[PDB]
Amino acid sequence: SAALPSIQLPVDYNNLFNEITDFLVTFKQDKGPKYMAMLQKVANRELNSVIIDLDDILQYQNEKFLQGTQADDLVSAIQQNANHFTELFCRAIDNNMPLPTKEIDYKDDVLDVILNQRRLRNERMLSDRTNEIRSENLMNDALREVVEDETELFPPNLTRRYFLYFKPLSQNCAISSKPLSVRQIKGDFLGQLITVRGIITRVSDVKPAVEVIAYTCDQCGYEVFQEVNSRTFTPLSECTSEECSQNQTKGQLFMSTRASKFSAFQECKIQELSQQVPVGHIPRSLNIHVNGTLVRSLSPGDIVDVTGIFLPAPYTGFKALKAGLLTETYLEAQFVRQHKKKFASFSLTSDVEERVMELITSGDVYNRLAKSIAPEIYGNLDVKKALLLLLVGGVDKRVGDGMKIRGDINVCLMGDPGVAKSQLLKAICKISPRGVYTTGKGSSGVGLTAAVMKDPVTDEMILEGGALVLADNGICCIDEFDKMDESDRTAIHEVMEQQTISISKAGINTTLNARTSILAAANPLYGRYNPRLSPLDNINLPAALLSRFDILFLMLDIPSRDDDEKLAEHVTYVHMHNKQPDLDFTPVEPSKMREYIAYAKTKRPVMSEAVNDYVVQAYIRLRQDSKREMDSKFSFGQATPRTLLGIIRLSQALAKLRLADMVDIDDVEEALRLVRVSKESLY
Amino acid sequence: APDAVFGDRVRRFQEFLDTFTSYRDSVRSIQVYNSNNAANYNNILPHRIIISLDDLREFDRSFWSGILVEPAYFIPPAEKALTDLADSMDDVPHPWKLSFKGSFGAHALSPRTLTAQHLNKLVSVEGIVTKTSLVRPKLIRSVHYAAKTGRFHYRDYTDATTTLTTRIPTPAIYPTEDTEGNKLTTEYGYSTFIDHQRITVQEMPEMAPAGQLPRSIDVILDDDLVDKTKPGDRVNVVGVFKSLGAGGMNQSIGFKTLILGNTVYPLHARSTGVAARQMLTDFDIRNINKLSKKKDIFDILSQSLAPSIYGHDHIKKAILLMLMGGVEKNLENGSHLRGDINILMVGDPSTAKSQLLRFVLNTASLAIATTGRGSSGVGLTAAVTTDREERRLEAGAMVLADRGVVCIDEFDKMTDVDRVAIHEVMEQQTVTIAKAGIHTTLNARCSVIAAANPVFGQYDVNRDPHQNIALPDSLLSRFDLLFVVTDDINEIRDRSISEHVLRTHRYLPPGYLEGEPVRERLNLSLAVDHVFEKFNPLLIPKLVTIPFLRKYVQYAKERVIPQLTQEAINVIVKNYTDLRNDDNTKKSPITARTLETLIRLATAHAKVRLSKTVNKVDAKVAANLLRFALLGEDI
Amino acid sequence: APDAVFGDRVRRFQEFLDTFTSYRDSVRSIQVYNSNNAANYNNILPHRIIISLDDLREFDRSFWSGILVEPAYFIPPAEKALTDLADSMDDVPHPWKLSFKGSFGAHALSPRTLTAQHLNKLVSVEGIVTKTSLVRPKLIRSVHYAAKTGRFHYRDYTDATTTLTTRIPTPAIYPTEDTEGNKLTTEYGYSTFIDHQRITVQEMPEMAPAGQLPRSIDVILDDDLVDKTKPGDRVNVVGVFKSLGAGGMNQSIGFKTLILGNTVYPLHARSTGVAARQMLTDFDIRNINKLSKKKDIFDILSQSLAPSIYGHDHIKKAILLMLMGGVEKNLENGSHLRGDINILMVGDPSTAKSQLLRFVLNTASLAIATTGRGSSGVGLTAAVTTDERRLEAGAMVLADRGVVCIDEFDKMTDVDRVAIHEVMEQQTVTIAKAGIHTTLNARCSVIAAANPVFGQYDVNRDPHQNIALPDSLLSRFDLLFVVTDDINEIRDRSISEHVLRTHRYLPPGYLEGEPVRERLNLSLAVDHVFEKFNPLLIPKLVTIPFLRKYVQYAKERVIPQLTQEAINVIVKNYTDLRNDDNTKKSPITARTLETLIRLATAHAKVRLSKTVNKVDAKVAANLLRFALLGEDI
Ligand SMILES: Nc1ncnc2c1ncn2[C@@H]1O[C@H](COP(=O)(O)OP(=O)(O)O)[C@@H](O)[C@H]1O
Ligand SMILES: Nc1ncnc2c1ncn2[C@@H]1O[C@H](COP(=O)(O)OP(=O)(O)O)[C@@H](O)[C@H]1O
Ligand SMILES: Nc1ncnc2c1ncn2[C@@H]1O[C@H](COP(=O)(O)OP(=O)(O)O)[C@@H](O)[C@H]1O
Ligand code: BEF
Ligand code: BEF
Ligand code: BEF
Ligand SMILES: [Mg+2]
Ligand SMILES: [Mg+2]
Ligand SMILES: [Mg+2]
Ligand SMILES: [Zn+2]
């Protein structure tokens, strides 16, 4: 024992194992014990994931401590050596696994039937050996240990289907609770359970990762399983089972993919946020190995607090730079919490139902939501309504023939410098769950190219998406629209209309799918608007591009002794107290905003005959009026078939805001009012 | 096996430590701070100490020379002595390590002069960091658990770069199984991992031989010294110049050489990312507090910015307010309100605009100097480098000038495309990449000052200012103060200028002779006698020394966080409304940015007066500055 | 590399030592004795302590079984704990080593039964020492000196034997040069050397099977254990049964197996070289003195020797005096005077001459039994091996300060008695043979038995024809007794009842018909005063181990001196013995005067008197008169 000394460590693992078993058996304060019920669910093949909440463990410890029984800080020990406790917990699950209440049908998946076969074979082996030893004629209490020693069966790891994950202790309980930036993940935290907060940039495709590879040796009829615990491994040549290694028979062994064990694997990559980066540095990234059923829970551009185990890996760089046992580090994901919930993930659960109806009962949800976005901005309310309509979005129509209507709004915010267009765009970026704040020129040139590159993890030549693809089903928030290269405007044409990007350059011959709603802020030609020039000559947008904008605000700056002092008082209040001036007003919290908007999105209102008759009359009068003064100094181009379609989209989204599931005349009247007042600031 | 000479050196160093009680006091401070932070939670400050090599040379020439020229044999005894002193001192229930500062004599080198005849010696190399390997932890001790026996086993690990002495090379294999043969499971979180970072120091371009390829040396930083600096900094890395490897002598061209890091000193140089902090003694803070009481404090400070330059007092006041800056405001919804003020100078040639820019570069804590087109739009902001080792991000000028100043010169010569990319940095104080699959928002909270001659060479009174400036209206809006200066031929003013210039040129530095040429000083300040200056080119105010002004700015920026008051708010609102609704052909367009800059200038003046609140006088002074900038009114 | 198991064993043994304070007190006594010895100079007890394994078994069964089964992992922790205890106690500004006594269960073996299954286990072997290597020093640390620098360098050596656990093999290279190439001058007198001796233990002849080759084991002794035994001793060596070397497993028939020595015990046995020392408690000393205050103490002790032997009271008194012995005089110039009493018993068959000799053999502190023709003059004195030419100590040399019991003295060859002359008188053995000129020292007292020449002592002929021995040899013997088996009805009867009473003797706990089992009685060399059963049935009879204690105490403590009243009595008795003719059984020489003085001194010893009085001289004269004249008062 000279080579390997020993240490007196405060932790004990058998007592902790017994505590773990007790907690699993007898935790029910959250129809019987919660985790026993979950295990029963898993036995019936209904569930393939087991989430052990550390909050439950803390509550169990605390309740056992009040009654008098001393309980070791199992939660602290998990927070210190989480990797070993995963094995402890899976062994405990195997020791308490309930019997299935429904047997194996033909609808069940292959892994379940293979595991059932393995369990039946293990039981048959054990019973056969027990029968043989009983017939040898030498009580089952003694016989069971002997049979277990003399038997060769399927190990528990290869007979379990559930995946096991932890959940960090919540911050409201008062180290896993505190979210840490990537820079603060030093070498001290290795092996613990930590929560890293940051943006997700790159997510690989789901590929099968080998846990244990199964070989078949038909000469001796044995299945041999080689565990794999690295990026690479080596196959076998001689059957290492007892007979082929012992007898003169040398059995050839072959791999079996179906019999082997795999796991869904994804090498994500989280990145530091702008708030966490210190002064003068640039964000750095940390690799995440998402494994098991947790795959596809992370997408690029997400802002998440991934909780996982900070495990080391052997050094993978150049050998010359190596000086000692250098270790590369990663984070094995356990639990993922999204800062901004996705719109496509909305379920009207009773609690979401109550927060939502409380918003409904507030009355005037449309105006309250409109004034809610960016409260620090004063007096720009029609633009806020338009942006809310942009967030809600119309209804996509795909007729049986194949025609597809956009169903999304494309808003522009042309106006003078210093009217808080960029701050409106940044606010919308805050409320919106997905959206890129693309701005300026040059940077956009490669942010829409979407070219092809090889992924390091799988060696796949995955295409890289630009800003617009990353903003799929989001808001593109393009800033400084007028100062941006014409080459990208050519792509913006097709993105706005067809919702897809067609690329036919060298190496790429595909058509990207980019369903996006574009918000554009820009200055007119010659900077400040000149009233002497016609609006079309001063907006500078070509008639094709301008047609795609459902609403094009003017936001002209016209000084006045009253509005100027109103704005000045508002801004000075915002500076002197970090809050909107309005005492009686209640700015809705952004989470409630997102929730209501998400509920609204599910509704898909349709049209009524009176509504479409009114819309047709409006379109006729708009077309004739546009034709009349198309050559005047107050012209706004010529109305196009899209202009009605925009009216349709705004009316449908307004109906979605009332959740009316059917459009009324008032919605159309408000939509026409918005479209008309979008141009009334130039008088 | 114990060694007698080792113990003798240990005793000598303990005697040295007892002689200079400053180090003992510093160790006590470290330990009490760590204990207090432990008690507060029922930043741990690292186990390190700084040794003044001058003090050691005074105490014992033999020991000082031994550390300097034979560090592998002298440093470990001193470290053990320090560890024993810490253990004895720590009456309250990981060895300590040394760090060295002082004059290294002939061993103060640069990566060009680092020849083999300095090997195995303590050296102090200075240069610019160019590469920083990402911090990869190193495994020094691995704890394993044996399931069968239920006991924990450990093994210690080491390599050549860990130990200054050459410990006997023993292979370090990982304990897969126990002595009895039982399976062993690794116990992370109980194993001890230590950080490790390789940084490369290149000779500074300020003193590199022009036109020749550079020379680089690798530095291995471990533990507390990791992540101490970033690429593009200036460092003074003192450490043992170790030589490693077999040198190819073993049957497989030279020996691999590197510097084991003992101390890293980020060095402040003009137009570099390293900020220039200064030590504030209680005497200095007392002087600052006393001087802040005067009513003419703003004038006194403003006069001291550019004593050489005659006049331009309003410009100097604006520059001082820029150096103080405003308070940036962050709200719950996520909106960020600019708290930095930008100044643009437009005027005739030889109006001392470039001189003011150079002084701002020379006096701010963190300033970056750029020219018109030498720093392109890629040079400013930031852009992806597409490095093959992949798609790294390189911070341009403005990102490196976070919480600092950017001194752009010849703003008019800038490309239109270059000035397109500057809008977001000016207003939103962020740089968005959104390029090549990289979506990032770097933080660039920089204050921009620019000088640019009018398009017609000399400002044209006959033409309107819109024709002369030729800058986009948005860019002019983003600039808080747009000063339009001129070279006007006036007898009295010009003869006063001549008097001042001839007075300035007739200056003899105190430690100099008449015909003695002035020797250039690099002045690489390290990021860590009276207040008033007797010499004055302009005569009778009291002018403060530039280092004292730097101390004043450093104190005011950190200590004071002013807040607005209703009294100041009324004045600001009245001034804003009067400016917006009165037409007097102002030089700049008047928008809500004018209100914002009124607020920020009032806040800056409040910071100058060291006031916790913004008062009426600050609002009046800010309005006066703005009116001087636009109308030209001066009272 | 600190270890948790090692530290826990260390603290467990420290708790054990704290529990049984006797070991702590012994360590304190050793320390204070060494300090006092250093104090007198402005012997050194070794840093060793004896542990009773029984107390360890009682205190901690697990640790006890660990020591016995796997001593490699248990003895070093115990030694470290003991060293820590000694350092802590030694507050006044070389590790301690550990030794064991007690029962070893199934590990108490002989060299025949040391099968390989006992390897790496603390064994207690018993046997006879055949070969002892020379006590050689072993280099463990070598202090060198660099002439140029002036700094002393040192290195520490080790080998598999000196440590129980296998250490990583570091070749022993003697430092000839400094690290910088400077020449080094070895500093003897500063480097440390440890005595090393190997002894071979062979199966004990008493317990060995007869007619089969013996089996032997090798014992490695170290430091204070060296030279604690003499070849031919019976020892109980306890230590680890370690196996050393690759044992041919590494390419060049078993493994080198030896017993590393932890403790060696010279085992006293019948007719061996080792003496038997009895511990004298203060209770024993008080009883001894109190019994010495008795009047007929000489009679009480003499009657206590052979109660099962009727009569021969004067022979018993002579044997008691011989066991006590007289004082030895070494004059300043160099001359030597014999201080031992020799006894010769010549008598008819079945007069108990041999049984008395066997009693003396079993009860003397150091006795060796020989027969006449079987043991030659080579067996007595000493012999040269010729193997180079080493001396083999014979019977008389081994019995120095002891007793030699020769049987069948009449049968022994004339050459043998020629050899025995000088040993009996001058108490030296001179070799001066084959180029080996040494004078071995053999100061022993001889008791012998011989039949009369005509088979029975026929009183019709003169004593000379019956004795049939040279006159000089009879002069050597201090007391010559002639015992005749004469028919007398009263005496025959009394003898009959005495012998019958002896035969119907029951052990304390044996059945009436149970067979009595013999025991070897291997006493370890370092209940009442009287005996319950007296076969002669009031004069008290002392218990025979108490008699051994009394003899030891008298021999050690008391050295009598002659006084004028005695001188006169002895002078007159010698004169009237010499000048009067009564047909004595022996002629009278100055040796008779020496015998009178020696018997007087022995009697004074018996009374524990620092001086010899008139009564002792009277007793000596009367005993000698009974010896020679055959008559008393
Ligand atoms: N209506 C307004 N409400 C609040 N702040 C405003 C308003 N108009 C302008 N501002 C302020 O003026 C500045 C202009 O912000 P920004 O969004 O960059 O303007 P733009 O993009 O329109 O040029 C900001 O400091 C903003 O807070
Ligand atoms: N008002 C002034 N006071 C002192 N020196 C001045 C003044 N105006 C110009 N100079 C001097 O004239 C030179 C030109 O100044 P510079 O800053 O290079 O001019 P420009 O405005 O063309 O950049 C410098 O040497 C400067 O010291
Ligand atoms: N006086 C006696 N008292 C007791 N037993 C005696 C006596 N004389 C002889 N015996 C017994 O007779 C036997 C012969 O004694 P032993 O010493 O062998 O005689 P020997 O003088 O021929 O050597 C022994 O068993 C001894 O006990
Ligand atoms: F001057 Be703003 F960014 F339109
Ligand atoms: F002639 Be200057 F540098 F504007
Ligand atoms: F017959 Be006996 F042994 F003198
Ligand atoms: Mg903008
Ligand atoms: Mg210039
Ligand atoms: Mg006989
Ligand atoms: Zn096989």
The topology under which CATH files domain B2-107 is mini-chromosome maintenance (MCM) complex, chain A, domain 1 (3.30.1640)
Reported as type and span, the H/E element at residue B313 is helix B313-324
Q: What's the CA-to-centroid distance between A419 and ligand 4, angstroms?
A: 7
Taking any CB pair shorter than 8 Å as contact, residues of chain A touching chain C are 1-2, 5-8
Instruction: In whole angstroms, give the CA distance from residue C410 to residue C372.
Output: 7
Q: Is A473 left (phi over 0), alpha (psi -120 to 50) or beta?
A: left
Q: Answer positive or negative: Cα dihedral of A131, A132, A136, A141.
A: negative
Query: What are the helix (H) ranges across B276-312?
Result: 282-291, 297-305
State which amino acid sits at residue A101. Answer: T
Provide the token pair at C289: 């003195």
Measured in degrees and rounded to the nearest 5, phi and psi for residue A335 equal -140, 140
Ligand 6 contact via C349 beta carbon (within 6 Å):
yes
Do residues C603 and C298 lie in contact, with contact meaning Cβ atoms separated by under 8 Å?
yes
CB C110 within 8 A of CB C203: yes
State the CB neighbour count (10 A cutoff) for residue A38. 19
Task: Tell me the H-state helices in A393-533.
Answer: 421-431, 443-447, 467-470, 486-498
d(CA C239, CA C402): 31
Our answer on whether the CB atom of A527 is closer than 6 Å to any ligand 4 atom is no
The Cα A607–Cα A644 span in angstroms is 14
State the pairing for strand pair B343-347/B446-452.
parallel
CB C242 within 8 A of CB C283: no
Residues C165 and C76: beta-carbon distance below 8 Å: yes
Q: Which of B423, B428, B471, B594 to mutate to test the pocket of ligand 4 (most atoms within 8 A of CB)?
A: B423
Distance between CA A375 and CA A564 in Å, rounded? 17
Q: How far apart are CA C100 and CA B195, in angstroms?
A: 52
B474 contacts A190? CB cut-off 8 A: no
HSE-CB at C494 with a 13 A cutoff on CA atoms is: 9
With a CB cutoff of 8 Å and minimum separation 6, the contacts of C606 are C297, C298, C301, C320, C321, C324, C554
Q: How far is it, in rounded angstroms, from Cα B398 to Cα B381? A: 5
Contact B329, A575 (CB under 8 A): yes
Check chain A for breaks (C–N over 2.5 Å) and list the residue before each, or none: 30, 138, 174
How many angstroms separate the CA atoms of A674 and C310, rounded?
148
**Rounded (5°) CA angle A323-A326-A328:** 145
d(CA B611, CA B561): 8
Query: What is the C-alpha separation between B610 and B618, in angstroms, rounded?
Result: 12
Q: Which of residues 313-332 of B touch C (CB under 8 A)?
A: none
Secondary structure element (H or E) that encloses residue C490, with its range: helix C489-503
Q: How far apart are CA B192 and CA A37, in angstroms?
A: 40
Q: Which residues of C touch A5 (CB under 8 A)?
A: 1-4
Closest CA to C395 of C383, C385, C386: C383
Cβ proximity of A215 and A289 under 8 Å:
no
- A1:C3 CB<8 A: yes
Confirm if C606 and C298 have CB atoms less than 8 A apart.
yes
B350 marked as part of a ligand binding site: yes
CA atoms within 13 A on the CB side of B53: 22
Distance CA C132, CA C231 (A): 6
Do the Cβ atoms of B140 and B193 come closer than 8 Å? yes
State whether C151 and B1 contact (CB < 8 Å): no
The annotation status of B352 as a binding-site residue, yes or no, is yes
- Residues near ion ligand 9 (CB < 5 Å) are C 354
Q: Tell me, yes or no, if C8 comes closer than 8 A to chain B by beta carbon.
A: no
**Within 10 Å of residue A467's Cβ, how many Cβ atoms?**
31
**Residue recorded with tokens 């041919």:** C248
B353 labelled as ligand-binding? yes
What span, in angstroms and rounded, lies between the C-alpha atoms of B439 and C94?
Answer: 71
CA C417 to ligand 9 center in whole angstroms? 19
Q: Tokens representing A218?
A: 């038909």
Nearest CA among C455, C463, C272 for reference residue C369: C272
Handedness of CA C108, C114, C115, C117 (dihedral sign): positive
Please state, in angstroms and rounded to a whole number, the distance separating the CA atoms of residues A46 and A121.
23
- Residue B244 backbone dihedrals phi, psi, to 5 degrees: -125, 175
Distance CA A563, CA A570 (A): 10
CB neighbour class for A68 (10 Å; exposed up to 12, middle 13-18, buried from 19): exposed
Ligand nearest to the CA of A224: 10
| Ligand 1 centroid, distance to A424 Cα (angstroms) | 9
**Across the interface, which of C2, C73, C168 has its CB nearest the CB of A5?**
C2
How many Å apart are CA B218 and CA B216, to the nearest integer? Answer: 7
Alpha-carbon gap, residue A309 to B216, rounded angstroms: 38
Q: CB atoms < 10 A from the CB of C593, how many?
A: 17
User: And the tokens for A510?
Assistant: 């595909």
Query: What gap in Å lies between CA A678 and CA A556, rounded to an integer?
Result: 10
Q: Which atom of ligand 6 is nearest to the CA of C349?
A: 1
Query: Which are the contacts of A236, defined by CB distance < 8 A and separation ≥ 6?
Result: A215, A224, A226, A253
Q: Pairing between strand C256-257 and C243-244?
A: antiparallel
What is the distance in angstroms between the Cα of C508 and the nearest Cα belonging to chain A?
50
Closest Cα of chain C to A119: distance in Å?
41
Distance CA A376, CA A384 (A): 12
Amino acid identity, residue B173?
A: I
CA atoms within 13 A on the CB side of A215: 20
Residues 6+ apart with CB under 8 A from C345: C315, C353, C356, C357, C447, C448, C449, C450, C481, C483
Contact C341, C321 (CB under 8 A): yes
Residue A470 falls in which region: left (phi positive, over 0), alpha (psi -120 to 50) or beta: alpha
Burial of C105 (0-12, 13-18, 19+ CB in 10 A): exposed
Q: Per residue, what are the HEC states of B451-500?
A: EECCCCCCCCCCCCHHHHHCCCHHHHHHCCEEEEECCCCCHHHHHHHHHH
How many angstroms separate the CA atoms of A307 and A336, rounded? 6
Structural domain including A639 reads: 349-678
By CA distance, what is B152's nearest residue in C? C4
The answer to whether B582 touches B347, Cβ cutoff 8 Å, is no
Per-residue H/E/C for A69-119: CCCCCHHHHHHHHHHHHHHHHHHHHHHCCCCCCCCCCCCCCHHHHHHHHHH
Judge contact between C482 and C454, C-beta under 8 A.
no
b/e C512-548 (16+ beta carbons within 10 angstroms → b): eeeeeeeeeebbebeeebebeeebbeeeebbebebbb
Alpha-carbon distance A381 to A285, whole Å?
40
Is the separation of the CB atoms in B201 and B129 below 8 Å?
yes
DSSP state of A374: S
Rounded distance between C-alpha atoms, residue C593 and residue A391, angstroms: 141
CA distance B65 to B69: 6
Do B56 and B63 touch, CB atoms closer than 8 A?
yes
Among candidate residues C106, C113, C127, the one with its CA nearest the CA of residue C237: C127
First to last CA, chain A: 93
Instruction: Please name the residue ranges forming H helices in C504-613.
Output: 544-557, 564-578, 590-606
Helix (H, G, I), strand (E, B) or coil at A207: strand
**DSSP H helices in A26-53:** 34-43
Phi, psi dihedrals of residue A81, rounded to the nearest 5°: -135, 50
CB C315 within 8 A of CB C356: yes
Beta bridge partners of B145: B152, B185
Provide the shortest C-alpha distance from residue B113 to chain C (in Å): 30
Q: Give the list of residues 6+ apart from residue C567 with CB closer than 8 angstroms, or none.
A: none
- Helix, strand, coil distribution of chain C in percent, nearest 5: 35, 20, 45
Tokens for B11, please give them: 């005793």
Residue A171 CA, chain-centre distance (Å), reads: 21
| A221 torsion bin: left (phi>0), alpha (psi -120 to 50), beta (else) | left
Q: How many helices (H) and strands (E) does chain A have?
A: 21, 20
Residue B57 token pair: 């040379």
For residues B220 and B214, the answer to whether their CB atoms sit within 8 Å is no
Question: What is d(CA A390, CA A649) in angstroms, rounded to the nearest whole number?
Answer: 10
What is the CATH number for A534? 3.40.50.300
The finding on whether C451 has its CB within 6 A of some atom of ligand 6 is yes
SS3 A201: strand
Method used for this model? cryo-EM
Helix B592-608 to helix B566-581 angle (10° resolution) is 140
Tell whether the torsion through CA atoms of B301, B306, B311 and B316 is positive or negative: negative
Could you tell me which residues of C are annotated as the binding site for ATP?
347-354
Compute the distance between CA of residue B198 and CA of residue B239 in angstroms, rounded to an integer.
13
Taking CA–CA distances from A279, the nearest residue in chain B reads B402
Alpha-carbon distances of C347 from A192, C303, C312, C344, C480, rounded to whole Å: 100, 21, 12, 10, 11
Nearest to B48 by CA among B210, B263, B219: B263
Q: Are strands B196-202 and B216-222 parallel, antiparallel or unpaired?
A: antiparallel
Dihedral of CA atoms B136, B137, B140, B141 in degrees, nearest 10, equals -140
In this structure, are residues B381 and B444 in contact, taking their beta carbons and an 8 Å threshold?
yes
Which listed ligand is nearest to C351 at the C-alpha?
3
From B408, B453, B468, give the residue whose CB has the most ligand 5 atoms within 8 Å, as the site to mutate: B453
Q: What backbone torsions phi and psi does residue C305 show, to the nearest 5 degrees?
A: -70, -65
Q: First vs last Cα of chain B: how many Å apart?
A: 84
Separation between Cα atoms, residue B602 and residue B570, nearest integer Å: 12
Ligand 3 pocket (Cβ < 6 Å) reads C 308-311, 349-355, 495, 498-499
Resolution (A): 3.8
Q: Does C4 touch chain B (CB under 8 A)?
A: yes
Distance between CA atoms of residues A436 and A429, nearest Å: 7
CA atoms within 13 A on the CB side of A242: 3
User: Do the Cβ atoms of A508 and A463 come closer than 8 Å?
Assistant: yes
Q: Report the sign of the C-alpha dihedral through residues C492, C495, C499, C501, in that order.
A: positive
Token couple for C382: 């000493």
CA distance B30 to chain A (A): 20
Amino acid at A677: V
Cα–Cα distance measured from residue A108 to residue A118, given in angstroms and rounded to the nearest whole number: 16
The CB of B477 under 6 Å from ligand 4? The reply is yes
Question: For residues C485, C489, C492 and C493, what is the CA-based torsion angle, rounded to 10 degrees?
Answer: -170
Beta-bridged to residue A463, according to DSSP, are A452
Distance CA B268, CA B236 (A): 11
Take atom 1 of ligand 4 and give the residue whose Cα is closest.
A417
Cα separation, A613 vs A602, in Å, equals 26
